Amino acid sequence: EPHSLGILHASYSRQILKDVSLYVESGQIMCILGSSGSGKTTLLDAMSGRLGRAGTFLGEVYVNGRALRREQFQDCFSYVLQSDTLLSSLTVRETLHYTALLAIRRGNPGSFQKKVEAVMAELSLSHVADRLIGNYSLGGISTGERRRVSIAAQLLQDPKVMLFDEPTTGLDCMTANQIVVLLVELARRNRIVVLTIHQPRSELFQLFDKIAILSFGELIFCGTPAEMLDFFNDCGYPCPEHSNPFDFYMDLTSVDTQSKEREIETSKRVQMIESAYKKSAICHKTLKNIERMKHLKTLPMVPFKTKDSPGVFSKLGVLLRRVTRNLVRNKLAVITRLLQNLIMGLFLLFFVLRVRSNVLKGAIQDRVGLLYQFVGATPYTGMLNAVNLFPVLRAVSDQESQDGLYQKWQMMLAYALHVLPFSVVATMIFSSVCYWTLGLHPEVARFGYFSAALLAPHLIGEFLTLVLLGIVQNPNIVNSVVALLSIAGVLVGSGFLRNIQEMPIPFKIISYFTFQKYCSEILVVNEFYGLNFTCAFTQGIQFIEKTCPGATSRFTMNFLILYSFIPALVILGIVVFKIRDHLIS
Amino acid sequence: LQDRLFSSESDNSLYFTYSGQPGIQNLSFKVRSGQMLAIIGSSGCGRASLLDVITGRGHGGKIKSGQIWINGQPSSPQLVRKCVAHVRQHNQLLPNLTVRETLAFIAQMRLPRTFSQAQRDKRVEDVIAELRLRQCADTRVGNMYVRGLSGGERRRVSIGVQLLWNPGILILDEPTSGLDSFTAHNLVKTLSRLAKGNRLVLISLHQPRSDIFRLFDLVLLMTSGTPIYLGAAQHMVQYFTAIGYPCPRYSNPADFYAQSLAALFLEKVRDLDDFLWKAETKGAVQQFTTLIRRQISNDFRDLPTLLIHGAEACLMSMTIGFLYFGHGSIQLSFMDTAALLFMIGALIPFNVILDVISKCYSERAMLYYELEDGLYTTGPYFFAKILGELPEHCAYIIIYGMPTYWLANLRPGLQPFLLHFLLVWLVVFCCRIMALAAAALLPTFHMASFFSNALYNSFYLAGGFMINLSSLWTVPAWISKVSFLRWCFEGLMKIQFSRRTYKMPLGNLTIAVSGDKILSVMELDSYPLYAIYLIVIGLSGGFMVLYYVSLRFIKQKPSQDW
């Protein structure tokens, strides 16, 4: 009931944080104000365990008896980021149901929600619980309210020590305060609360148990507002009325560089102001209190934060249900996955009409182009699918996994897994409609094959695009590159445009490495197995031979290989993402 | 803090009566060529809107009530752009130019034909030195990606861009936002300095904090579309001591928020005062060159993009070439040699489209240029850019078009080469314009970059090779005639592979006898050697006209996309 959270002589590396030291008890609030130079944020992040870097972390943190160990931070803290991205097509209760259902293993998918209720109603958002969360533009969850929910997700973990980054920032007169309140209330509910506040008002100065200043990662004052209003006048420089006590104090606290003159002078000031209460009684006192908690053992005598969030095998199964749910409740999106592939076939169908086969005037040459386009579009549709849908999920995996919920790949797997249904329907929608309208040897079986041959590319695009979207982080580039890829590919890797066998050395090698080849050399054989054109050539095989001779026999396999890529791509993906958790801090 | 003033000139001021807009409620103004007024309203009270409303450019949904008067006249969107200078939060300065340049280059368009050159030169400096852009003078501007220039300075420059008519009015939207408080002072004091001249200054600061506060001359404080009250720095402190003030700061109160014949005389008097208030008050060619010079300078001092484009093209040529490598055992298969000739044409689009859509769309500048009045579209910008790219575009083509030709061993000597190249030129160039049109008329990088890729995917089918042409609906059958991709292919084909030239088509052991007959047998003899250039240069026309229209009649406005 008095909870203990102290720091002694903490530092960080290129040595951005210097021998800082601070005391807090449950029910209090900590207000960190950091100069634009800051350091503040850096620390706050650091403490939540976000990374542990080239360089180092000096000092140790004392939490309710005992010292914290580097390997336990994330266990005994909770973190609320500068922003709060959430999946735009779910309901509050659903996002929370999934965060909770993912974070903990207990009663049932019914009872979970009941826990959720305590959180929603403890945060006073029950009243929107089951609406379209929305982006601010799409759906109209309150731009204030959303912030609120983000907090909810941390409370399912039942922490009693909470860290919030810049959480006023990006709001308005009314809302900011409304949010601040709720922080403080959480403090009322026997919690520890730490803030890094960029540009707050003069009204709020007076709402803080403990306010504390950082300059260039060097610590300065920490204490009661009144205490600052005194001890800073113990250092001199009293802040007049009509100055914003909260803000004025900072102006003095930070050096800056409009010239060498303004620059050097001020750094001396902030040094002297630092030493001033680096020595002072209060700064002794605060320190002693962090020495107190070890020295004493008292009633709280405990730390706390969550237990078991297990079965990885089980874990992502949820992530899937979530993602499919998202992607399904988004009329915008779904329609396209299924449909565009068809659009391709219509759009062609419209120019090409049906396959004139009577004459040779418009016979092989109309089909070559047709297959070509299919093989060099059905991966395009893939990325068109991916690049557009996935980033949200990707970045949400990013901001989520950091708090400690599901490893980066989990998600990528999930996405990759759901597409199957959709893409596979798309392929069928497309095929069923077009293939017969174009009427290129129509025995159902050979349609059946043609629909399996164009499902693969439409996935390959997806999963490649996916993989890349883990490595490259600026989708619109990914969507240029993957195009270039999946077009270049066809040129070299189906016979059509340069009689592969005939082509000069190296490209030949390349071709064998592209799915394109092993798709085309299906489609050609599947659609020419044997046919007869009126007139150069004459028969179905006589063309098969010219472009891709070993296809006829090899068909059985080709499929094997064509579908071979799609496990690989995703498997690789896993690795890229497994890696990528290290890449961005 | 050092020095006082090197610019100022006179006259105008500003006047209001009972406004309203969906968000505003009954304003009334004092604005007098020397005061600076800080609008210190709540977060989005039509506050960042307010200034844009006052200019006439209204987001919210067009005004409800009101009257607006400048120095001594009504308001008008045609009027304001001759009196008032607007400084946005958005900066749109060209990455690779020096401050001195980015000023001189606008000076040459905003200062009148009559002005001397020495005048422009001295005016530039006469600004620089009033804004104390002392050592920024000959250093490049855009921190955007050179990252070799200060922000506090940058702002002052984009302000300077506006002080080249020494305007009697000046409106700044949230100028501090971004800067460090340390410098905010040193900016807002320069704004006050400006103000001491015969400049009228309007600011809008939603989170001003105390210190900057102290520097206000006039203040207007409003919460969500009502004025709590107008007044000077000091006076406000006292005036809301009709309801009693506190310890913290000056924005606290922002958070807290004829009848008697006696008055009748005052009513009359204010009217009488009021009269007195007003009573006291009472070329294309040249542009065009400037534009291409500035436009072309920056784009040429940009190396990074420039190396890439070269590479970006180069490599395509390399590969296309090798892939159809015309020497060595393997022999180009007339079957195949067409393919190349088609590709070389209908490949580069898929880069160039995105290449030039990207640029045009990453230009919003022109909007602010349109509205601020730097540029026409009569003989002005439509020509500005279309020529601006050109030199790049020539290298871009040559790098892509020569090597392929040789690698794939097309017809020898020269003549053909150049007819070839020259066509590729008009094809790709037509395509650039197509993009420009597509981009300027549509409203989003993504959107224009769809319309384009659909319009292109639609032209390649029409193209001869991949679909045989003759056999078609009228709907393509007609379209094909319009397809630069097709015309490229027929052109190249006619110049290269048929004409009264002669060929050796062949498989395995063969090296056979043949000629122009081949193309006659192919459906392509239809149009002649030299027609096609005209067809594509004509096609160009169509898109060109779409660009000239889309610009002249239709705005390009900002998008966040790329």
Q: What is the 3-state secondary structure (H, E, C) of A476-535?
A: HHHHHHHHHHHHHHHHHHCCCCCCHHHCCHHHHHHHCCCHHHHHHHHHHHHHHCCCECCC
Smallest CA-to-CA distance from B353 within B247, B227, B445 is with: B445
Q: Distance of CA B535 to CAs B340, B350, B431, B473, Å? A: 22, 22, 13, 22
Q: What are the backbone dihedrals phi and psi of residue B557, each rounded to the nearest 5 degrees, phi first?
A: -120, 165
> Which two tokens mark A407?
């490893």
Rounded CA gap, A304 and A585, in Å?
26
Smallest CA-to-CA distance from B353 within B467, B480, B462, B442 is with: B442
Q: What are the backbone dihedrals phi and psi of residue A345, each rounded to the nearest 5 degrees, phi first?
A: -70, -40
Contacts of A386 (CB under 8 A, 6+ apart): A415, A461, A462, A463, A465, A466, A469
Q: What are the backbone dihedrals phi and psi of residue B171, each rounded to the nearest 5 degrees, phi first?
A: -125, 120
- Out of B43, B182, B561, name the one closest to residue A173 (CB): B43
Angle between helices A364-375 and A515-528 (to 10 degrees): 140
What is the number of helices (H) and of strands (E) in chain B?
A: 24, 11
Burial tier of B329 (Cβ tally within 10 Å: 0-12, 13-18, 19+): exposed
Rounded CA gap, B390 and B150, in Å?
33
Residue keyed to tokens 């992607």: A327
- Out of A203, A368, A504, name the one closest to residue B330 (CB): A504
Is B339's CB within 8 Å of A498's CB? yes
Burial tier of A380 (Cβ tally within 10 Å: 0-12, 13-18, 19+): buried
Rounded CA gap, B448 and B435, in Å?
8
Residue keyed to tokens 């970045």: A395
3-state class (DSSP) for residue B163? helix
- CA angle, residues B28, B34, B37, in degrees to nearest 5: 45
What type of residue is A51? L
A240 secondary structure, DSSP code: P
- CA angle, residues B213, B214, B215, in degrees to nearest 5: 90
Query: Which 338-357 residues of chain A touch chain B by CB within 8 A?
Result: 347-348, 350-353, 356
Contacts of A166 (CB under 8 A, 6+ apart): A41, A82, A196, A197, A198
**3-class secondary structure for A372-435?**
HHHHCCCCHHHHHHHHHHHHHHHHHHHHHHCCCCCCHHHHHHHHHHHHHHHHHHHHHHHHHHHH
Q: What are the backbone dihedrals phi and psi of residue B203, each rounded to the nearest 5 degrees, phi first?
A: -125, 160
Contact status of A244 with chain B (Cβ, < 8 Å) = yes
B463 secondary structure, DSSP code: S
Rounded CA gap, B514 and A418, in Å?
57
Contact status of A305 with chain B (Cβ, < 8 Å) = no
Q: Which residue of B has its CA nearest to A36?
A: B180
A527 neighbors A371 (Cβ within 8 angstroms): yes
B2 secondary structure, DSSP code: -
Contacts of A382 (CB under 8 A, 6+ apart): A423, A457, A458, A459, A460, A461, A462, A463, A464, A465, A486
Is A372's CB within 8 Å of B466's CB? yes
A492 neighbors A514 (Cβ within 8 angstroms): yes
Q: Are strands A29-34 and A210-215 parallel, antiparallel or unpaired?
A: parallel
Rounded CA gap, A372 and A491, in Å?
9
Is B248's CB within 8 Å of A476's CB? no
Residues of B in contact with A476 (CB under 8 A): 561-562
Smallest CA-to-CA distance from A489 within A470, A514, A508 is with: A514
Question: What kind and span of H or E run contains B415?
Answer: helix B415-441
Q: Which residue of A has its CA nearest to B478?
A: A351
> Which two tokens mark B224?
């969500």
Q: How far is CA B148 from the centre of its chain?
A: 23
Question: What kind and span of H or E run contains A19?
Answer: strand A17-25
Q: Nearest 10 degrees: CA dihedral of B293, B295, B299, B301?
A: 40
Is A203's CB within 8 Å of B323's CB? no
What type of residue is B127? V
Smallest CA-to-CA distance from B168 within B378, B283, B7, B346 is with: B7
Rounded CA gap, A386 and A397, in Å?
15
B527 neighbors B516 (Cβ within 8 angstroms): no
- Out of B323, B350, B468, name the one closest to residue A507 (CB): B323
- Out of B182, B223, B471, name the one closest to residue A361 (CB): B471
Query: Residues for chain A: how many in total?
Result: 585
Q: Is A275 annotated as a binding residue?
A: no
B93 neighbors B154 (Cβ within 8 angstroms): yes
What type of residue is B71? N
What single string gives the DSSP state of each residue in B369-398? HHHHTS--SSSSSHHHHHHHSHHHHHHHHH
Contacts 24+ apart (CB under 8 A), A330-335: A330/A89, A333/A388, A333/A389, A334/A422
Selected residue of B467, B521, B522, B562 to mutate for chain A interface (largest A Cβ count, 10 A): B467
Residues of B in contact with A362 (CB under 8 A): 468, 470-471
**3-class secondary structure for B61-122?**
CCCCEEEEEECCECCCHHHHHHHCCEECCCCCCCCCCEHHHHHHHHHHHHCCCCCCHHHHHH
Q: Nearest 10 degrees: CA dihedral of A133, A136, A138, A141?
A: 30
> Which two tokens mark A210?
């403990």
- Out of B42, B152, B249, name the one closest to residue A242 (CB): B249
A29 secondary structure, DSSP code: E
Closest CA of chain B from A502, distance in Å:
7
Contacts of A407 (CB under 8 A, 6+ apart): A312, A401, A577, A578, A581
Residue keyed to tokens 């000139």: B9
> Which two tokens mark A151?
């907090």
Q: What are the backbone dihedrals phi and psi of residue A125, each rounded to the nearest 5 degrees, phi first?
A: -135, 0
Contacts of B489 (CB under 8 A, 6+ apart): B338, B341, B342, B345, B346, B463, B464, B465
> Which two tokens mark A8?
């002694």
Residues of B in contact with A372 (CB under 8 A): 466
Contact status of A497 with chain B (Cβ, < 8 Å) = yes
Contacts of B265 (CB under 8 A, 6+ apart): none
> Which two tokens mark B339?
């393919």
3-state class (DSSP) for residue A6? strand
Residue keyed to tokens 């396959």: A355
Breaks (C-N over 2.5 A) in chain B follow: 22, 257, 282
Residue keyed to tokens 């009204």: A203
> Which two tokens mark A12?
């960080």
3-state class (DSSP) for residue A339? helix
3-state class (DSSP) for residue A321? helix
Question: What kind and span of H or E run contains B226?
Answer: strand B226-232
Closest CA of chain B from A373, distance in Å:
9
Q: Is A39 annotated as a binding residue?
A: yes
A133 neighbors A96 (Cβ within 8 angstroms): no
Rounded CA gap, A496 and B342, in Å?
14
Contact status of A201 with chain B (Cβ, < 8 Å) = yes
Q: Is A38 annotated as a binding residue?
A: yes
Is B471's CB within 8 Å of A356's CB? yes
Q: Are strands B86-87 and B169-173 parallel, antiparallel or unpaired?
A: parallel
> Which two tokens mark A345?
């076939």
Q: Nearest 10 degrees: CA dihedral of A390, A394, A399, A401?
A: 130
Rounded CA gap, B468 and A363, in Å?
9
Rounded CA gap, A460 and A342, in Å?
18
Resolved by: X-ray
B205 secondary structure, DSSP code: -
Phi-psi region of B478 (alpha: psi -120 to 50; beta: other; left: phi over 0): alpha
Dihedral sign from CA coordinates of B334, B339, B340, B344? positive
> Which two tokens mark A205?
């100065």
Rounded CA gap, B231 and B213, in Å?
13
Rounded CA gap, A286 and A24, in Å?
9
Residue keyed to tokens 């079965």: A311
Size of interface A-B (CB pairs under 8 A): 135
A500 neighbors A547 (Cβ within 8 angstroms): yes
Residues of A in contact with B248 (CB under 8 A): 202-203, 205-206, 241, 244-246
- Out of A257, A366, A499, name the one closest to residue B333 (CB): A499
Closest CA of chain B from A13, distance in Å:
25
Q: Is A40 annotated as a binding residue?
A: yes
B357 neighbors B440 (Cβ within 8 angstroms): no
- Out of A362, A373, A498, name the one closest to residue B336 (CB): A498
Closest CA of chain B from A537, distance in Å:
13
B452 neighbors B434 (Cβ within 8 angstroms): yes
Rounded CA gap, A447 and A437, in Å?
12
Q: Distance of CA B148 to CAs B142, B153, B156, B301, Å? A: 8, 12, 16, 15
- Out of A203, A206, A257, name the one closest to residue B255 (CB): A203
Q: How far is CA A12 from the centre of its chain?
A: 27
Burial tier of A185 (Cβ tally within 10 Å: 0-12, 13-18, 19+): middle
Contacts of B496 (CB under 8 A, 6+ apart): B341, B410, B411, B416, B420
| Percentage helix, strand, coil for chain B under 3-state DSSP, each rounded to 5 | 55, 10, 35
Dihedral sign from CA coordinates of B289, B361, A170, B253? positive
> Which two tokens mark B49?
């809107």
Largest CA distance in chain A: 105
Residue keyed to tokens 């032209």: B459
A81 neighbors A165 (Cβ within 8 angstroms): yes
Rounded CA gap, B349 and B432, in Å?
8
Selected residue of A202, A340, A361, A496 to mutate for chain B interface (largest B Cβ count, 10 A): A202
Give the HSE-up count for residue A225: Cα atoms under 13 Å, Cβ half-sphere. 16
Rounded CA gap, A422 and A326, in Å?
14
B370 neighbors B394 (Cβ within 8 angstroms): no
CA end-to-end span of chain B: 42
> Which two tokens mark A536?
């150069």
Rounded CA gap, B67 and B18, in Å?
7
Q: What are the backbone dihedrals phi and psi of residue A17, each rounded to the nearest 5 degrees, phi first?
A: -140, 130
Burial tier of A246 (Cβ tally within 10 Å: 0-12, 13-18, 19+): buried
What type of residue is B97? L
Task: Record the resolution, in angstroms.
Answer: 3.9
A124 secondary structure, DSSP code: T
Rounded CA gap, A23 and A317, in Å?
43
Residues of B in contact with A205 (CB under 8 A): 248
Rounded CA gap, A426 and A464, in Å?
18
Q: Is A37 annotated as a binding residue?
A: yes
Beta-bridged to residue B7, according to DSSP, are none
Beta-bridged to residue B14, according to DSSP, are B31, B70
Closest CA of chain B from A176, distance in Å:
11
B61 neighbors B21 (Cβ within 8 angstroms): yes
Beta-bridged to residue B73, according to DSSP, are B70
Q: Distance of CA A14 to CAs A39, A270, A561, B190, Å? A: 12, 20, 51, 36
> Which two tokens mark B22?
């969906």
Rounded CA gap, B36 and B31, in Å?
8
Smallest CA-to-CA distance from A274 within A198, A212, A194 is with: A212
Rounded CA gap, A181 and A312, in Å?
38
> Which two tokens mark A403?
């708090």
